[PDB]
């Protein structure tokens, strides 16, 4: 199934792009293609990593999210970037953790734990989300654009520093070849993807928010980290947990700060400004994760809980 | 005392209703009557339950709340329904748990624990409250009524499913007779109670919110679960805790979803839309409960803490 | 260094006040002086305390905060009072705990714990902050001034009662002499400090909020409790933790209620009304504290986390 979706994806995505027919179906072709490419992009990142390993983990483990957002910045579609960063933490904490706890929840009794790590990894989540996303949002309302992105830059610079500082202290040959392949393919698909967003909104009626928080996030970040759902089935939950939380952590502490600083160069800037639904969805998820990482790691319904929360948010983001 | 308040209550409530004198005192007569009826309604529900036991626990354990809200929907007084559902979680988490921890707090040393269950029961509370009440509220502001109650219906359908799924997996003869008696009596009292609400507001100056969140909630849900305060005195705290949290859980996951779906039939619908004070009171209580269920189960001041929070909210709901 | 800042401070503060030159530099002279005086005020409070000990701990341990706010009330500058009470919990939870966890974080392995106390002290924090500061704020929007300060008075009266009730149940000669000295000196410096606030705002461009939440709070409360940073270095973390959380607790439960009731006498009243940034900064800090008090008590980066949160808030309060 993984090979088929790539082998069909790229050709179709080339021909559709060349023919320019039509604006609607091109979206559907792009999204499915990148899903397949993203898993392979995650497997290559994983296999390469199995000191500098953490850097490639934060860079290439979130690469499609970085890539899609990069071209979104060129088109000035800064809302979608924020939407996708919102949706990347949602997916990690509620979908790729939810499906790991549900699908891997056939073992039934309990699940692999490192209580020390789970309780420490919530300690950073709160810091990452409940401060460094909440604080800029609420402080920014009556700030003015200059001070807005200065605070963003301020938070962004310290979040990468505090992420990289802890990181500094605390087959293999095909990995680089396939990673170099998938990247460029994705990049070229992503460039044309950004131009599709305005038509999809009008023709379907969907809000650009829905597209960003859900469609772009599932395809991009969530697919890259779908290795955790498989890892949960092979009774290695503590890594499936480690992947979900860790990825979210680097999205909040590295990826989002990366985007904010780099957005200042072209054309011009995006501050860490999240809508109310986007913000409260993120904290609720974080709280629900701390409330689920504490207890038994998993159960079928415990994963169903995390999933129930997601679909609700998703349909809420659809209905706005 | 329990027999007297029923024996005086019903007759008085019949004569006052027939005489139609006056609109003000009828309220006072109704409320006191139902208090007495509700404890007996809780005792019958308990005795009947001591697989299907969980259904009658969620149905008849919250029956007066369902009954008062049912006729409130017929009068179109949808605000009071939301107010009473707000006040049912408040009472459970802060009053009937607060008085269990205070009155039963004469033991002094510690109190009956099941740390596994308390930590798991917070995990669902957050899901139930901090997502499935918060998310609909904040997402709904700029949604439009169609999408509003569609999201409500959406959340409602999955919350009952997720509640009933876990429930499916995981003297006695007088119980049904007294339960069948109390129900009908309550129902007929409740029908006439709803019509009293508009006059009480005007003549006293009270907001309909105050009446719903406090007066209706204490009389209805809190009285039904007052068995926990007695159970705490008999040094069985872990059931007094189990009652408070469990009841709140089924209010958020079964009762409130029940009301939302059924409200669509007559005349027309109520979405899960809570005011700001109603919403933030509910999360604060939930957080304070997790902060108090973790530590020693009880102490006198630990129960006084939970009670101090309540009276504050109550006078705040009075002063709005 | 401690002697020099007092010995230079008072004289300079006398001469500058007499000469009336200028409005700008007088601020700088006052603030530095009180920093030095406040540590000595904390040492005297500590040495006196090492039943009634808890009263002097809550009174004189927060004395400069009480003193600066007292004269702020006379000038009617009620915003600064709320700003400084906001900043006193911020500092305690993020600065004086952050610097204790960072500077004392050279031990490296772990740090002194009393998990029972830390988990209990969060239980009151949530109550103190997430209810008794949040609830009055959100409930007050559409209340009217009469009901506003009535709710404040209501919350204030029960918070001191609930604080004093638990307290009731549960060199030395120079201490009183130096405490009596520092108080009067501070009081006279503070009186002239309040009059400086309006010019500093205009001439620098700073918001009076920034001054209150940060400048007044660091100088006042944070300096008094800087003993904890030293105590962390002497490998006595559990007292450095006890100081930070305890002080915050008495600020929320005694100091702030003290100010509210006493403010009603002159000239007229201040309700517990906090701006949105002030409120969300306080809960985020509290959450981050619970997320950091749970795990290892300290690590260098764990203290750097708490500090990173602070500077962000601080620059956000600067940029508003």
Swiss-Prot record, chains A, B, C:
Changing residue 65 to A: Lack of activity. One of its GO terms (molecular function) is calcium:proton antiporter activity. Pfam families: Na_Ca_ex. Keywords: Antiport, Calcium, Calcium transport, Cell membrane, Ion transport, Membrane, Transmembrane, Transmembrane helix, Transport. Changing residue 247 to A: Almost no change in activity. Changing residue 61 to A: Decrease in activity. Induction: Transcriptionally regulated by the forespore-specific sigma factor, SigG, and the general stress response regulator, SigB. Homotrimer. This is Ca(2+)/H(+) antiporter ChaA. It comes from Bacillus subtilis (strain 168). The lineage of its organism: Bacteria, Bacillati, Bacillota, Bacilli, Bacillales.
């Amino acid at each position: 199934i993984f090979f088929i979706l790539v082998a069909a994806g790229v050709p179709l995505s080339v021909i559709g792009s060349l023919m320019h027919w039509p604006s609607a179906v091109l979206f559907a072709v792009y999204c499915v293609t990148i899903i397949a490419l993203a898993s392979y992009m995650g497997r290559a990142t994983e296999s390469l990593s199995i000191r500098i390993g953490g850097l490639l983990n934060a860079t290439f483990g979130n690469a499609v999210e970085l890539i899609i957002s990069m071209f979104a910045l060129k088109e000035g579609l800064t809302g979608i970037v924020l939407a996708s960063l919102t949706g990347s933490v949602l997916g990690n904490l509620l979908l790729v953790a939810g499906l790991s706890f549900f699908v891997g929840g056939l073992k039934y009794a309990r699940q692999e734990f490192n209580i020390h790590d789970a309780r420490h990894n919530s300690g950073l989540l709160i810091f990452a989300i409940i401060v460094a996303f909440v604080i800029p949002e609420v402080f920014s309302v009556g700030m003015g654009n200059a001070s807005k992105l200065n605070l963003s830059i301020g938070i962004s610079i310290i979040m990468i520093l505090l992420y990289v500082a802890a990181l500094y202290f605390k087959s293999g040959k095909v990995a680089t070849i396939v990673l170099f392949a998938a990247t460029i393919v994705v990049a070229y698909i992503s460039e044309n993807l950004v131009h599709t967003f305005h038509s999809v909104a009008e023709q379907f009626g969907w809000s650009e928010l829905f597209i960003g928080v859900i469609i772009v996030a599932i395809v991009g970040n969530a697919a890259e980290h779908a290795s955790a759902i498989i890892m949960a089935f092979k009774n290695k939950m503590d890594i499936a947990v480690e992947i979900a939380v860790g990825s979210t952590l680097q999205i909040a502490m590295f990826v989002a700060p990366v985007l904010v600083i780099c957005s200042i160069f072209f054309p011009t800037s995006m501050p860490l400004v999240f809508t109310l639904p986007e913000l409260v969805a993120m904290v609720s998820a974080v709280l629900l994760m701390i409330a689920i990482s504490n207890d038994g790691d998993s159960n079928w319904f415990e994963g169903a809980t995390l999933l129930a929360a997601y679909v609700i948010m998703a349909i809420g983001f659809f209905l706005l």
